[PDB]
Design an enzyme around this catalytic site. Structure first.
Site, mmCIF file in Angstrom:
data_model
loop_
_atom_site.group_PDB
_atom_site.id
_atom_site.type_symbol
_atom_site.label_atom_id
_atom_site.label_comp_id
_atom_site.label_asym_id
_atom_site.label_seq_id
_atom_site.Cartn_x
_atom_site.Cartn_y
_atom_site.Cartn_z
ATOM 1 N N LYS A 289 -28.384 -5.934 -13.562
ATOM 2 C CA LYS A 289 -28.573 -4.475 -13.561
ATOM 3 C C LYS A 289 -27.278 -3.748 -13.249
ATOM 4 C CE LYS A 289 -33.503 -4.348 -12.157
ATOM 5 N NZ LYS A 289 -33.893 -3.715 -13.456
ATOM 6 N N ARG B 275 -42.988 -10.103 -15.190
ATOM 7 C CA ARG B 275 -44.103 -10.496 -16.035
ATOM 8 C C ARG B 275 -44.202 -12.027 -16.086
ATOM 9 N NH1 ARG B 275 -41.980 -7.267 -21.121
ATOM 10 N NH2 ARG B 275 -41.262 -6.067 -19.299
HETATM 11 C C1 LIG Z 1 -35.568 -5.420 -19.424
HETATM 12 C C2 LIG Z 1 -36.838 -4.696 -19.739
HETATM 13 C C3 LIG Z 1 -37.520 -5.348 -20.955
HETATM 14 C C4 LIG Z 1 -37.803 -4.767 -18.563
HETATM 15 C C5 LIG Z 1 -37.242 -3.943 -17.348
HETATM 16 N N1 LIG Z 1 -38.089 -4.212 -16.220
HETATM 17 C C6 LIG Z 1 -37.481 -4.538 -14.907
HETATM 18 O O1 LIG Z 1 -36.247 -4.551 -14.772
HETATM 19 C C7 LIG Z 1 -38.408 -4.819 -13.699
HETATM 20 O O2 LIG Z 1 -38.256 -6.093 -13.214
HETATM 21 C C8 LIG Z 1 -38.071 -3.756 -12.634
HETATM 22 N N2 LIG Z 1 -38.549 -4.191 -11.382
HETATM 23 C C9 LIG Z 1 -38.778 -2.503 -13.140
HETATM 24 C C10 LIG Z 1 -38.605 -1.172 -12.245
HETATM 25 C C11 LIG Z 1 -37.949 -0.065 -12.792
HETATM 26 C C12 LIG Z 1 -37.800 1.113 -12.047
HETATM 27 C C13 LIG Z 1 -38.311 1.179 -10.766
HETATM 28 C C14 LIG Z 1 -38.974 0.081 -10.208
HETATM 29 C C15 LIG Z 1 -39.126 -1.102 -10.960
HETATM 30 C C16 LIG Z 1 -37.218 -2.526 -17.640
HETATM 31 O O3 LIG Z 1 -36.126 -1.954 -17.772
HETATM 32 O O4 LIG Z 1 -38.240 -1.881 -17.754
HETATM 33 ZN ZN LIG Z 2 -36.098 -6.852 -13.528
#
Ligand SMILES: CC(C)C[C@H](NC(=O)[C@@H](O)[C@H](N)Cc1ccccc1)C(=O)O
Ligand SMILES: [Zn+2]
Ligand SMILES: CC(C)C[C@H](NC(=O)[C@@H](O)[C@H](N)Cc1ccccc1)C(=O)O
Ligand SMILES: CC(C)C[C@H](NC(=O)[C@@H](O)[C@H](N)Cc1ccccc1)C(=O)O
Ligand code: NA
Ligand code: NA
Ligand code: NA
Ligand SMILES: [Zn+2]
Ligand SMILES: [Zn+2]
Ligand SMILES: [Zn+2]
Ligand SMILES: [Zn+2]
Ligand SMILES: [Zn+2]
Lengths: 484, 482, 480
Positions: free
Chosen positions: A258, A332
């Site tokens: 990230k 997931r």
């Molecule tokens: C890479 C994508 C397909 C999936 C990605 N999801 C994630 O990074 C999750 O693990 C994050 N934990 C999602 C999240 C976003 C904002 C606040 C709290 C939690 C996302 O950006 O939604």
């Molecule tokens: Zn994530």
């Protein structure tokens, strides 16, 4: 904890070091508005709070005759009073637009208690508040003792439960490890005389939970994973209910790292798992007539030489293979295997909670959780109950076009969508691939990525963790059981 | 390694295999300009160097009558001669706008620094034929001054080159342990007291901010808290010099882009300068008790890395909300400054390659000076500028101070704003300076000149030794008043 | 505006609908603290304001015994009373030197009423109209009226600048700027010349014209030249301001995040218009010229381009590598115009570099130049007037970074570092040798416009530059 005392007496005869009076829809006509002229002189028009210094009355505006609005104002009032030197405040009973009385009493009592919470453990200047008690004069602003007794018990249990979840979610990641999550679950089990199982990576291996294990691989030797399984089993159980939570105690994205601006607040990626721990506390103390299982998959998603990789193909416990194209879609994967473990219980109802996707937050805002699943009646019950509890919720619909976007050319399914659009929903459709045919009409997926953690005060929530999911799911289970 | 021989003789009677003659402000009138027509024939107008082949005279231009430009020109001259086959060069004594002592230091230092380059890893490395500069003690425009300046030049060259070699050392080699080894050598050379503390000592002193930065790489390269002490027979002041020894900085989990991560072997610039300073100040025999404190660690990424959202309890006691792991130096310094203050010094100066924002604001060639005490800040600036370093004061104000607040801790390790980064970093450090030390403290951000990827002034490609000359001059001038 | 009435009476005997009392450094001991135990009961410890409802006393905290913090608190106090229903407030005289404290109180109070709320539908007139100043010392009459005259002129001048800077760009065109300058000239009986693109062409100001090329047919450029010429002039001073009424970056287009607030790129030119108004009304003994180069920097098919090589009025050629470095091109030609006037001092004001804001923060302006005494005079005087300033030093290494392989100079630096200073050094290329020791460059990119309240400044425009340059001119004339 704000102690609330119910007293059989008029508001006027009740004694406390100060008073709290709500102003609903700018109506200043009530007898409890002791000095109307002062309010005119200093131009108070019912927006926010105003303190009559001479009479020691805190007025708190409620924009509309609305229970939801009442809960908020009651919280603001106590936050305001928390910084003052009054040991006690007295308040009468209000009945705003919502049966109505009980829900108004619940909102008042919970609102008031929640106004004391702030995550200030690490602040050096933190003070114990002088404010210890609210005296509730059982007199209508517009059986009362029985309904107030019922609402106070709810408020007491729900405040404790919410604050458990919030203290955990707010806990920084060096401290709030998967082992730490298990310890908080162990306390809740001991407090409530629950059965608890805390499984490790060897159990995961034996159950072939290789999706869950893959996420943990980077950090196994630093913080091993924990599968937390809480059980509440009362003498009469009308339903078996499985609550499954994403316990990601830190999500850095893995190898798909990230950016810095997006990695901050990811201590809150255990929001779902934490909510499930709080839910077992609430439901046990409310003594609901159901067998309730709390299942939390806890791990970090770290980066390092042993991390799972884009291009990895993992064999889920369910048997389906998963092409990994982005290690930042880790929740997931943990959930795929935790849902599988959950279905092995043969529950009547399965609800998962997860801070799962950024796309949900883009779609709905920071303050609203998404509800997904197949059974419309079930989704409607969660939504209706959850809204009444004071949580903001919205259903998001599956469709067959979105379902195709998680196809893989080399595996049974891909852990990301081929599209930049519909992320919250394709994520729910990913989870669906691990829900067996016989549970498809019994499963709800709730994406709390928005409201689980917000970097400002809003409604009854202080900066940081909110305990999203707990009130809504509690209401949903109570309404479920009322029909069973 | 350029020997300077002082001689009681005229420039013409002195003997060497070639000559160096400075041309100041395009004035070619002097007797030492032996064949002026040659310079006309080939259009030499005093810009840069020009070698008279028949007379073996190297001319070096000095654009303005200025002691700093003389220092630079002397460096360039020797750099030029280093590549040739003359074993020795003779030069006269020059006196540019400064004075005599200052000019002699400039000349001798400039000449000696001309030999330095970081060519350790070059396969075509050649040892120079040039070994000596014969200085004819005759004025272009004394012996006691020359001797004093030669002593300074010798000590400062050695000190700067110690620092430059350390800073230039690549990170696989230049570990925290390696820094401690270099410190040990300096301590042994000067009979200094030295303490080298590890992570167990850090834990004991609850230096959790320091420890947090090191957690990702603890099992690979453990941290070192290095503590040198120079204690003379007469000590008019007690001075603590505190340095950021980040031997590599990849940003941690807040990973740096590739274009920004290159050159971060030099994030140990401040700690390295402190090591060189103890060498310089000891050999100069200054009348002060000098403590050199270096917090040495890498800032790596990995499964045990500290994180955005971590809240760290500093040794001083204040809690720190981490929102970006690339603001690591200020965490290490928060704890090293606390350790420093326990010594009860009269003056504390820290050196750190601390912020990109400093470099954006001042340029790559200039360091920033921060603090509360205006007389102390002015003394460092004036002394520093005279020593040939480029410096600027950056002012605190109450508006910037609000930008490092945290909703959930006593302080945040980054600013809420994209603006004023060098100064909010300084104000972060301030939160860990006790009231009784706030008027005794200077913060020097050398992120710019500590490492530059081109030749400039007396500095070869890479490490420059920034901070050493300026802090030396500061200490000397400080002891004058005491 | 906030009327200030000076009255020869005690604070106690003065009459107003409410009272203002300052708490300096948490000292609650003074007689004017009428009801102490109320403050104790409600945990007021002297941070921010607190209103004693029964006695109608507004307390305003001053953290330290400091004239600058007094200025701030006075502003906060009036912002607070503005929302209330009291028509007047009375205040005593504070001394945190007496003249300086009186100037800070009076200015502070008056600046408390300013908000840019012109386009708000809910805007309502304030009840608060007067501050009664009881001429009695917390711990005189001649100093009070001197400070009141300053406060009145400086409030007027600052608010002229803030209204102009805050004016959105569809309305706040170069023609609109010239109109505000025409009003200021007519008010003060000043000489004024407003020149257009044909004048720029005649004067060969091709750097200025280039920036305007994209938008010439929409909003033509204006060279504004105000002259204040008093009966007695000890110095001739040229004040030169960047009047970019909008800066989209041109072909080198700004991203959306960075384009918002660029209506304020006319901050420097606006400051010069306000200065002429302040300096004239104060009747300072100097001939003052105010020169504003006004244009937008837009994008379009006629826009000047990266790779363009422009011939400045001074004669030096400029390689354009980035059209978003447009201010220094306007200033290059305006400085040339300024120097033709043979001034004794030249000061330019410009919201010129992001790098300045990165280095110093949003609240502090940078001072550049060669003459250390002149820079120190501007810095010291400006700091006393209440502005935050820092000197940034030139050096020879930075100067090399603006070389061009194909022109005399490049309008950007080859390095990502030192941008505010290499911009200064670009300007220096167009300052003749005989003016190099008479010149100051002031980069007000930071505090000219800030998207929050701070000190005596409301959201948006601040009027940065005006107070500092006024103090500098006044102090300069003392020495002559
Ligand atoms: C890479 C994508 C397909 C999936 C990605 N999801 C994630 O990074 C999750 O693990 C994050 N934990 C999602 C999240 C976003 C904002 C606040 C709290 C939690 C996302 O950006 O939604
Ligand atoms: Zn994530
Ligand atoms: C994340 C930011 C708030 C702080 C960050 N600071 C750092 O990364 C420091 O650790 C760098 N070591 C500072 C630096 C920058 C450029 C050249 C040499 C040194 C910076 O970008 O300035
Ligand atoms: C392209 C660069 C060399 C120069 C560039 N300068 C500009 O864009 C100026 O024209 C801007 N008007 C300067 C500015 C930036 C931020 C806030 C206020 C004012 C800058 O980004 O600093
Ligand atoms: Na969130
Ligand atoms: Na550097
Ligand atoms: Na600005
Ligand atoms: Zn996640
Ligand atoms: Zn860093
Ligand atoms: Zn660093
Ligand atoms: Zn621009
Ligand atoms: Zn501009």
């Amino acid at each position: 904890m704000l102690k609330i005392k119910l007293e059989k007496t008029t508001f006027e005869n009740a004694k406390a070091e100060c008073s709290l009076v709500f102003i609903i829809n700018k109506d200043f006509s009530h007898a409890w508005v002791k000095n109307k002229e002062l309010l005119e002189t200093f131009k108070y028009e019912g927006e926010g709070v105003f303190l009559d210094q001479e009479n020691k009355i805190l007025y708190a505006g409620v924009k509309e005759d609305d229970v939801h609005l009442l809960r908020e104002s009651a919280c603001l009032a106590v936050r305001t009073l928390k910084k003052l030197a009054f040991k006690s405040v007295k308040v009468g009973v209000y009945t705003c637009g919502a049966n109505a009385l009980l829900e108004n009493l619940k909102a008042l009592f919970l609102g008031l208690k929640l106004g004391l919470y702030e995550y200030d453990t690490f602040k050096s200047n933190k003070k114990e508040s002088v404010l210890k008690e609210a005296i509730v004069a059982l007199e209508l602003h517009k059986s009362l003792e029985k309904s107030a007794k019922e609402a106070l018990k709810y408020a007491e249990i729900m405040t404790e439960s919410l604050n458990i979840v919030k203290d955990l979610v707010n806990t920084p990641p060096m401290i709030g490890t998967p082992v730490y999550m298990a310890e908080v679950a162990q306390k809740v089990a001991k407090e409530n005389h629950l059965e608890i199982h805390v499984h490790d990576e060897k159990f995961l291996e034996e159950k072939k939970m290789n999706a869950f294990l893959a996420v943990n691989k980077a950090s196994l030797s630093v913080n091993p994973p924990r599968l937390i399984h809480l059980v509440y089993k009362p003498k009469k159980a009308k339903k078996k209910i499985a609550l499954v939570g994403k316990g990601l105690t830190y999500d850095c994205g893995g190898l798909s790292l990230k950016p810095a601006d997006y990695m901050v607040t990811m201590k809150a990626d255990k929001g779902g798992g934490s909510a499930v721990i709080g839910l077992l506390n609430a439901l046990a103390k409310l003594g609901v007539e159901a067998e309730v299982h709390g299942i939390i998959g806890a791990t970090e998603n770290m980066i390092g030489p042993a991390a799972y990789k884009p291009d990895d193909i993992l064999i889920s416990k369910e048997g389906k293979s998963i092409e990994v194209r982005n290690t930042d879609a880790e929740g997931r994967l943990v959930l795929a295997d935790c849902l599988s473990y959950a279905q092995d219980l043969n529950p009547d109802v399965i609800v998962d909670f997860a801070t799962l996707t950024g796309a949900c937050v883009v779609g709905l805002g920071e303050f609203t959780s998404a509800i997904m699943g197949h059974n419309e009646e079930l989704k409607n019950l969660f939504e209706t109950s959850g809204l009444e509890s004071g949580e903001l919720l919205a259903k998001l619909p599956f469709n067959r076009h979105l379902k195709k976007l998680i196809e893989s050319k080399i595996a049974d399914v891909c852990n990301i969508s081929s599209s930049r659009y519909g992320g919250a929903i394709t994520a729910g459709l990913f989870l669906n691939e691990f829900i067996r045919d016989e549970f498809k009409d019994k499963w709800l997926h709730i994406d709390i990525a928005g409201p689980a953690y917000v970097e400002k005060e809003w409604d009854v929530n202080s900066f940081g963790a909110s305990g999203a999911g707990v009130r809504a799911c509690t209401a949903f289970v109570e309404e479920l059981l009322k029909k069973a």
